[PDB]
Design an enzyme around this catalytic site. Sequence first.
Site, mmCIF file in Angstrom:
data_model
loop_
_atom_site.group_PDB
_atom_site.id
_atom_site.type_symbol
_atom_site.label_atom_id
_atom_site.label_comp_id
_atom_site.label_asym_id
_atom_site.label_seq_id
_atom_site.Cartn_x
_atom_site.Cartn_y
_atom_site.Cartn_z
ATOM 1 N N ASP A 25 0.671 -1.127 0.004
ATOM 2 C CA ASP A 25 -0.169 0.096 0.129
ATOM 3 C C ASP A 25 0.749 1.195 -0.021
ATOM 4 O OD1 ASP A 25 -2.055 1.893 0.041
ATOM 5 O OD2 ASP A 25 -2.715 1.182 2.021
ATOM 6 N N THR A 26 1.373 1.744 -1.075
ATOM 7 C CA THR A 26 1.955 2.937 -1.195
ATOM 8 C C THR A 26 1.184 4.106 -0.503
ATOM 9 O OG1 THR A 26 0.958 3.404 -3.583
ATOM 10 C CG2 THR A 26 3.062 2.269 -3.380
ATOM 11 N N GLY A 27 -0.185 4.067 -0.421
ATOM 12 C CA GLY A 27 -0.875 5.475 0.275
ATOM 13 C C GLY A 27 -0.756 5.263 1.775
#
Lengths: 99, 99
Positions: A25-27
């Site tokens: 999850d880059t977020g």
Amino acid sequence: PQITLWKRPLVTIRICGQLKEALLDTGADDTVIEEMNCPGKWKPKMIGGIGGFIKVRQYDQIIIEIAGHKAIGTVLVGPTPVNIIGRNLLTQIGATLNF
Amino acid sequence: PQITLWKRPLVTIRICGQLKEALLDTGADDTVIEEMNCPGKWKPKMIGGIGGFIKVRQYDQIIIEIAGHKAIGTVLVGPTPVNIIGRNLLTQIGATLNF
């Protein structure tokens, strides 16, 4: 590998002697995993997302494998709907976004 | 570009006339932007994430330019903490996680 984004980028992770499935999850600034029991010193923490905030327990210097890559960092444990690997750990397995 | 994740992977986008800043988010199925007006018919939906659910307005076939790349598809406008670009558009621009 090269994970493509047609399907959720789910990956096997070993945390605390237990195999689990997590999301790349880059977020996420931080890493969050469903309620474990792995003892240790931890500080209380609240992390925010779309629908509001949840309470978590913050453990430091935790060891993880992420799709065969050894990492060591802060893991947050709490009532998360899916195990999430955020940037704190993604940097450590050398993950990048490309287009 | 290659984007490392030491910093939040933010980019400028062009949506419904406005320039805005958004997070390339591989954990999001959908793209959600802070409340703003976009023209056309929209239908109310509800999306989840950590913290729970929020009511959003769904716009279909919306042109978005993400970091100079063109996408055209669904944008969910609602009360998100941060503008996020989800897998529905990240795939449109050829985005992949690599490590």
